[PDB]
Tab-separated table of C-alpha atoms and ligand atoms in Angstrom:
chain	number	residue	atom	x	y	z
A	1	UNK	CA	0.245	-0.389	0.066
A	2	UNK	CA	1.041	3.784	-0.094
A	3	UNK	CA	1.947	3.484	3.525
A	4	UNK	CA	4.538	0.902	3.166
A	5	UNK	CA	5.333	3.530	0.402
A	6	UNK	CA	5.854	6.067	2.796
A	7	UNK	CA	7.503	3.702	6.092
A	8	UNK	CA	9.993	2.672	4.004
A	9	UNK	CA	11.307	5.648	2.558
A	10	UNK	CA	11.301	6.378	6.357
A	11	UNK	CA	13.092	3.213	7.394
A	12	UNK	CA	15.442	4.074	4.159
A	13	UNK	CA	15.744	7.767	4.991
A	14	UNK	CA	17.588	6.554	8.337
A	15	UNK	CA	19.964	4.620	7.260
A	16	UNK	CA	21.553	7.782	5.987
A	17	UNK	CA	23.753	9.494	8.227
A	18	UNK	CA	23.102	12.579	6.223
A	19	UNK	CA	19.465	12.602	6.040
A	20	UNK	CA	18.240	10.828	9.481
A	21	UNK	CA	15.283	12.403	11.228
A	22	UNK	CA	15.643	14.621	8.977
A	23	UNK	CA	11.939	15.333	8.413
A	24	UNK	CA	12.002	17.752	5.655
A	25	UNK	CA	13.676	15.502	3.418
A	26	UNK	CA	11.404	14.626	0.225
A	27	UNK	CA	12.239	11.188	-1.553
A	28	UNK	CA	13.846	12.194	-4.228
A	29	UNK	CA	16.872	13.265	-1.867
A	30	UNK	CA	16.718	9.788	-0.654
A	31	UNK	CA	16.729	7.990	-3.382
A	32	UNK	CA	20.041	10.447	-4.985
A	33	UNK	CA	22.082	10.311	-0.941
A	34	UNK	CA	21.209	6.220	-0.718
A	35	UNK	CA	22.944	5.868	-3.871
A	36	UNK	CA	25.041	8.116	-2.835
A	37	UNK	CA	25.949	7.130	0.185
A	38	UNK	CA	26.235	3.340	-1.173
A	39	UNK	CA	28.955	4.463	-3.083
A	40	UNK	CA	30.878	6.047	-0.025
A	41	UNK	CA	30.500	2.825	1.834
A	42	UNK	CA	31.153	1.026	-1.312
A	43	UNK	CA	34.987	2.499	-1.296
A	44	UNK	CA	35.833	3.191	2.645
A	45	UNK	CA	34.956	-1.089	2.530
A	46	UNK	CA	37.672	-1.094	-0.452
A	47	UNK	CA	39.792	0.944	1.803
A	48	UNK	CA	40.077	-1.331	4.720
A	49	UNK	CA	39.818	-4.824	2.417
A	50	UNK	CA	43.559	-2.627	1.207
A	51	UNK	CA	44.581	-2.169	4.839
A	52	UNK	CA	43.833	-5.610	6.125
A	53	UNK	CA	45.908	-6.922	3.255
A	54	UNK	CA	48.785	-4.908	3.630
A	55	UNK	CA	48.809	-6.206	7.446
A	56	UNK	CA	48.073	-10.042	6.423
A	57	UNK	CA	51.541	-9.648	3.875
A	58	UNK	CA	52.829	-7.287	7.128
A	59	UNK	CA	52.215	-10.733	9.038
A	60	UNK	CA	53.452	-13.009	6.773
A	61	UNK	CA	56.597	-11.568	6.536
A	62	UNK	CA	57.114	-11.117	10.663
A	63	UNK	CA	55.620	-15.057	10.585
A	64	UNK	CA	58.936	-15.534	8.184
A	65	UNK	CA	61.219	-13.301	10.454
A	66	UNK	CA	60.686	-14.476	13.372
A	67	UNK	CA	61.261	-18.422	11.800
A	68	UNK	CA	64.878	-17.032	10.196
A	69	UNK	CA	65.485	-16.097	14.005
A	70	UNK	CA	64.778	-18.658	15.736
A	71	UNK	CA	67.319	-21.096	13.750
A	72	UNK	CA	69.732	-18.677	13.211
A	73	UNK	CA	69.539	-17.644	17.574
A	74	UNK	CA	73.013	-19.439	18.335
B	1	UNK	CA	9.979	16.324	-11.660
B	2	UNK	CA	8.394	12.749	-11.763
B	3	UNK	CA	11.802	11.700	-14.598
B	4	UNK	CA	13.278	12.380	-12.155
B	5	UNK	CA	11.868	10.941	-9.627
B	6	UNK	CA	11.740	7.575	-11.545
B	7	UNK	CA	15.304	8.299	-12.949
B	8	UNK	CA	16.025	7.954	-9.566
B	9	UNK	CA	14.418	4.710	-8.191
B	10	UNK	CA	16.349	2.896	-11.131
B	11	UNK	CA	19.440	4.198	-10.447
B	12	UNK	CA	19.738	2.986	-6.883
B	13	UNK	CA	18.116	-0.921	-8.144
B	14	UNK	CA	21.618	-0.373	-9.679
B	15	UNK	CA	23.540	-0.748	-6.923
B	16	UNK	CA	22.184	-3.170	-5.246
B	17	UNK	CA	23.334	-6.361	-6.115
B	18	UNK	CA	20.257	-8.587	-5.217
B	19	UNK	CA	18.198	-6.681	-8.163
B	20	UNK	CA	18.473	-6.895	-11.674
B	21	UNK	CA	19.329	-4.315	-13.105
B	22	UNK	CA	17.257	-5.730	-16.254
B	23	UNK	CA	14.068	-6.477	-14.310
B	24	UNK	CA	11.673	-4.096	-13.116
B	25	UNK	CA	11.623	-3.886	-9.408
B	26	UNK	CA	8.278	-1.563	-7.514
B	27	UNK	CA	9.461	0.665	-5.636
B	28	UNK	CA	9.182	-0.625	-2.151
B	29	UNK	CA	11.421	-2.970	-3.788
B	30	UNK	CA	13.908	-0.885	-4.071
B	31	UNK	CA	13.430	0.478	-0.750
B	32	UNK	CA	13.894	-2.485	1.354
B	33	UNK	CA	15.872	-3.576	-0.945
B	34	UNK	CA	18.468	-1.165	-0.194
B	35	UNK	CA	18.027	0.023	3.232
B	36	UNK	CA	18.921	-4.310	4.020
B	37	UNK	CA	22.693	-3.627	1.314
B	38	UNK	CA	23.243	-0.539	3.994
B	39	UNK	CA	22.485	-2.847	6.706
B	40	UNK	CA	24.414	-5.481	5.549
B	41	UNK	CA	27.270	-3.305	4.871
B	42	UNK	CA	27.609	-1.620	7.657
B	43	UNK	CA	27.623	-5.051	9.829
B	44	UNK	CA	29.980	-6.098	7.126
B	45	UNK	CA	32.158	-3.214	7.798
B	46	UNK	CA	31.867	-4.304	11.372
B	47	UNK	CA	33.802	-7.083	11.175
B	48	UNK	CA	36.575	-5.916	8.736
B	49	UNK	CA	37.353	-3.023	11.858
B	50	UNK	CA	37.719	-6.635	13.702
B	51	UNK	CA	39.411	-8.397	11.678
B	52	UNK	CA	41.940	-5.604	11.419
B	53	UNK	CA	42.374	-5.160	14.838
B	54	UNK	CA	43.019	-8.264	15.265
B	55	UNK	CA	45.971	-9.035	12.529
B	56	UNK	CA	47.715	-5.353	14.450
B	57	UNK	CA	47.875	-7.453	17.439
B	58	UNK	CA	49.347	-10.322	15.941
B	59	UNK	CA	51.346	-8.493	14.620
B	60	UNK	CA	52.827	-6.592	17.565
B	61	UNK	CA	53.027	-9.762	19.226
B	62	UNK	CA	55.177	-11.192	16.280
B	63	UNK	CA	57.319	-8.027	16.667
B	64	UNK	CA	57.083	-8.225	20.544
B	65	UNK	CA	59.090	-11.846	19.908
B	66	UNK	CA	61.781	-10.317	17.170
B	67	UNK	CA	62.607	-8.066	20.091
B	68	UNK	CA	63.030	-10.856	22.402
B	69	UNK	CA	65.268	-13.102	19.920
B	70	UNK	CA	67.504	-10.297	19.278
B	71	UNK	CA	67.813	-9.219	23.198
B	72	UNK	CA	68.184	-12.654	23.759
B	73	UNK	CA	69.567	-14.623	21.513
B	74	UNK	CA	73.937	-14.978	21.079
C	1	LIG	CL1	8.929	14.061	-2.147
C	2	LIG	CL1	5.938	0.305	-7.891
C	3	LIG	CL1	5.410	-1.452	-4.608
C	4	LIG	K1	12.837	7.684	13.033
C	5	LIG	K1	72.151	-14.691	14.180
């Protein structure tokens, strides 16, 4: 119904930090800023993934150095 | 413009993985899947942050062991 459409616009609006609980936010703004927010959080996801990849590489290098020194301690 | 409103529904649809871009999704379906996708991504972001925090701890523990061996090996 149209109750459900209004309800669903509110619920989407409220996952967008810039628009949460803004009673003056119109439909087209909610749709476009939601689309923008999805892209923005994907960008942040990519940064986190890159950070993990770097930490894993560092983890592997450290473990390699640890093994080398354990075998070279005398 | 209701032309812009329609375009904006479709552009949001296009960013939602579980909605096929070649299929005409109802308005409430687009809204609800967008909301679900944003919540799901935010949860995954928290999981990525926890992975990063664990890797940083693991890497500090490895550096600590490397320091101990450098100090105590011959
Ligand atoms: Cl409106
Ligand atoms: Cl519809
Ligand atoms: Cl609908
Ligand atoms: K609310
Ligand atoms: K040595």
